[PDB]
């Protein structure tokens, strides 16, 4: 579930170290941190944090057996106010308007709460009631004219991360990262915003590359880790399985070095050995997809946009130039290719 390889993107200083100084690869995913550009600005948010969570508060109003509309709202004014209404017996049919029951917006058409019947419809002047179970009880608003549909955003302060031409994630007034990474686009009453992987909705411009949130936005979960935290154990143990076999024998082999490759992009460290001196270098790692994009021609290793040079036919992370000029990558010649040249070496002072 990891990238088949991780080729570096920018190597640098090559300094000498010994065995006692060997670290296993932080194989932890790190969010996009290249976006150091901190540009402050003002951005929109949903007033309540989340797409799912928003509500026009509301009431109910009963009937006689059907209720009437003009008074059921005029009854909502009194219950909050001029108090004009404040045996088994008979059905004594008159009205009452109990409240303190609200609702939530569902993102396509927004009128859903326990409402004996699933959903209702729209509540502009076209229809001034949302019938519910039976006929006895009728309406469910706060203000008679759509007050919440378009009047539920806010503005704020913050810093917009970015690299050069790509636009990066937010830093909030609460000091934290909220990234547009793998998000999706939502249009809210005209303004073009983005739902993040968290239900928090922003009104950021069309980032240079996104796709519309599907109608999979109702419970905010639907398509909604763990399996990855398992493999992290069983890989960064081969690192120490190998780090032990290098520490308890003073003898490295090019196979064992590959296990120290940072298996996921980001700022980690890169290792190789020329003869007897083990040496370290920092590198931002880049994901590899298939072997064809880094070994195109005889002896070549694509390092950004170049061919990395053969230094005695060894190249980093245990990649060596073999009998002919095939660049043989350890993990790649583990495609049913048995190759023996990479097994004996030593370490000193």
């Amino acid at each position: 579930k990891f990238p088949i390889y991780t080729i570096p993107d920018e190597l640098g200083p090559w300094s000498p170290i010994d065995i006692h100084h060997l670290s296993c690869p932080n194989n932890l995913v790190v969010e996009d941190e290249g976006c150091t550009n901190l540009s402050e600005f003002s951005y929109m948010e949903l007033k309540v944090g989340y797409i799912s969570a928003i509500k026009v508060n509301g009431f109910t109003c009963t009937g006689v057996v059907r209720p009437t509309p003009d008074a059921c709202r005029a009854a909502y004014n009194w219950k909050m106010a001029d108090p004009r209404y404040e045996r088994t017996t008979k059905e004594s049919l008159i009205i009452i308007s109990p409240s303190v029951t609200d609702l939530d917006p569902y993102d396509k058409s927004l009128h859903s709460r326990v409402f004996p019947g699933g959903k209702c419809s729209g509540i502009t002047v076209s229809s001034t009631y949302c019938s519910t179970n039976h006929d006895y009880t009728i309406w469910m608003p706060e203000n008679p004219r759509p007050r919440t549909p378009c009047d539920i955003f806010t503005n704020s302060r913050g810093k917009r991360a970015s690299n050069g031409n790509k636009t990066c994630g937010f830093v909030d007034e609460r000091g934290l990262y909220k990234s547009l990474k793998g998000a999706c686009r939502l249009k809210l009453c005209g303004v073009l915003g983005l739902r993040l992987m968290d239900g928090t909705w922003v009104a950021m411009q069309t980032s240079d590359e996104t796709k519309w949130c599907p109608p999979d936005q109702l419970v905010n979960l639907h398509d909604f880790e763990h399996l990855v935290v398992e493999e992290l154990v069983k890989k960064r143990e081969e690192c120490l399985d190998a780090l032990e076999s290098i520490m308890t024998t003073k003898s490295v082999s090019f196979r064992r070095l590959s296990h120290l490759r940072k298996l996921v992009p980001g700022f980690g460290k890169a290792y190789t050995i020329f003869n007897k001196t083990l040496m370290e270098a920092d590198a931002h790692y880049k994901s590899v997809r298939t072997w064809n994009e880094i070994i195109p021609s005889k002896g070549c290793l694509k390092v950004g946009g170049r061919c990395h040079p053969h230094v005695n036919g060894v190249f980093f992370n245990g990649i060596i130039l073999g009998p002919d000029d095939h660049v043989l990558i350890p993990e790649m010649q583990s495609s049913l290719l048995q190759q023996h040249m990479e097994l004996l070496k030593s370490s000193v002072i």
């Epitope: 058409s109 002047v125 076209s126 759509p146 249009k187 009453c189 005209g190 303004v191 009104a203 411009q205």
Partner: single-chain antibody
């Protein structure tokens, strides 16, 4: 093909605008505009059937969900092209326009400018009603139809640009608006106007719905 208009109608005469689009919840805001030559379009119909609140003379506004309509009252000075403009709610960001109906019977800008290579051009648009307001910018290529490019809600400091012009456009106390292009490439050579929308309630409010009534005018830019 976005909307639909008869290329021209001869003559009471009527123009249709099939393509009234109501989004996923129920909102529809066809808003018409008339274009005299070299003159900026004036708002003649908003919210399907309503007349412009200041000075209106022709009186017709119709809509049948799948069709909007416009029935002129008089039968010589009406002579012009006519365009419609509605909202759209799922995948599209702003407003759309028609394709020309040759009917047969205040603000400022930056001014006339030219550029040789695809480098930048910057327009100004001086002017406050104080209500909900979304300033925008529109493009008409030489003798073709209208084309919304992007918007800006100055209060929240957020801007919506369109898809064909994303990234190349950058729309932004003095009653002053602006507009910037990142690469002129000759296919964008056109005339550029500034306009906005100012209303309170959701009945005829969607941000960038088509209620462009404060209208600017006059940025004719040339690329080489």
């Amino acid at each position: 093909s976005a909307l639909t208009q008869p290329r021209s109608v001869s003559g009471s005469v009527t123009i249709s605008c099939t393509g009234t689009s109501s989004d996923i919840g129920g909102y529809n805001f066809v808003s018409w505009y008339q274009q005299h030559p070299g003159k900026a379009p004036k708002l003649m119909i908003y919210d399907a059937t309503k007349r412009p609140s200041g000075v209106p003379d022709r009186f017709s506004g119709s809509k049948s969900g799948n069709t909007a309509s416009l029935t002129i009252s008089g039968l010589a000075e009406d002579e012009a092209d006519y365009y419609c403009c509605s909202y759209a709610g799922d995948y599209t960001p702003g407003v759309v326009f028609g394709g020309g109906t040759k009917l047969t019977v205040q603000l400022v800008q930056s001014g006339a400018e030219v550029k040789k290579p695809g480098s930048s051009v910057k327009v100004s648009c001086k002017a406050g009603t104080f209500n909900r307001y979304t300033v925008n910018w529109v493009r008409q290529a030489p003798g073709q139809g209208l084309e919304w490019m992007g918007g800006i809600i100055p209060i929240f400091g957020t801007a919506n640009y369109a898809q064909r012009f994303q990234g190349r456009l950058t729309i932004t106390s003095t009653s002053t608006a602006y507009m910037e292009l990142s690469s002129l490439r000759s296919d964008d050579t056109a005339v550029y106007f500034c306009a906005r929308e100012n209303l309170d309630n959701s009945g005829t409010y969607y941000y960038f719905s088509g209620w462009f009534d404060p209208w600017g005018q006059g940025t004719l830019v040339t690329v080489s």
